[PDB]
Design a protein around this ligand. Sequence first.
Ligand SMILES: CCCCCCCCCCCCCCCCCCCCCCCC(=O)O
Ligand SMILES: N[C@@H]1[C@@H](O)[C@H](O)[C@@H](COP(=O)(O)O)O[C@@H]1O
Length: 133
Amino acid sequence: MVDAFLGTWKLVDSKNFDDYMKSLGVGFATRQVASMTKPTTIIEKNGDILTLKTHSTFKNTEISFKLGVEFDETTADDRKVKSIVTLDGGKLVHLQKWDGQETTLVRELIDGKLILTLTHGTAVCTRTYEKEA
Ligand SMILES: CCCCCCCCCCCCCCCCCCCCCCCC(=O)O
Ligand SMILES: N[C@@H]1[C@@H](O)[C@H](O)[C@@H](COP(=O)(O)O)O[C@@H]1O
C-alpha cells in the first residue's frame, strides 16, 4: 500500500546532505544553494502510476513510474540513471543505477513524518518532511 505516502510534504530537517551531494560529485556552488533550500515533495497516484514532484526555488524535478518497473530518470544533478521504485517493509525504496554506481532514496513514515534516507558511497543523509494539509 503506497497510500500513506501520498500528499504534499515540506522539508523540516536535514542531516548530511552536503556529504551526500559531494559523494555524487555536485559542485560547491550547487551544494551551497541546496543546503539552504527547503523543497516541497508532492506524491500522487493515478491507478498504478505514481508521480513524484520536487519543487524548490533552485531545482524542480518530476518523475512518473509504476512500482517495480524500471524507468529512465535524469536527476536534479543531471545524472542519467536507470531507476526502480518498490515497497519494501512498508518503505518506498527508489534505487538509481548509472556507470556501475548506485544510490538509494528510501522513504519511511515515522510518527506521521516522512523520513528520506539518501545513501551513496559511505554518505548517509537523513531528511525529514512534514505533511502539508
Ligand atoms: C529531485 C530533488 C531536487 C529538486 C529540488 C532540489 C533542491 C535541493 C534538494 C534536492 C536535490 C538537490 C539539487 C541540487 C543537486 C543535488 C541533487 C541530488 C539528487 C536530488 C536529491 C533530492 C533530495 C530531496 O528530495 O530532499
Ligand atoms: N529533463 C531534465 C531533468 O531530467 C533534469 O533533472 C533537470 C535539472 O533540474 P532543473 O529542471 O531544476 O534544472 O532539467 C530537465 O528538466
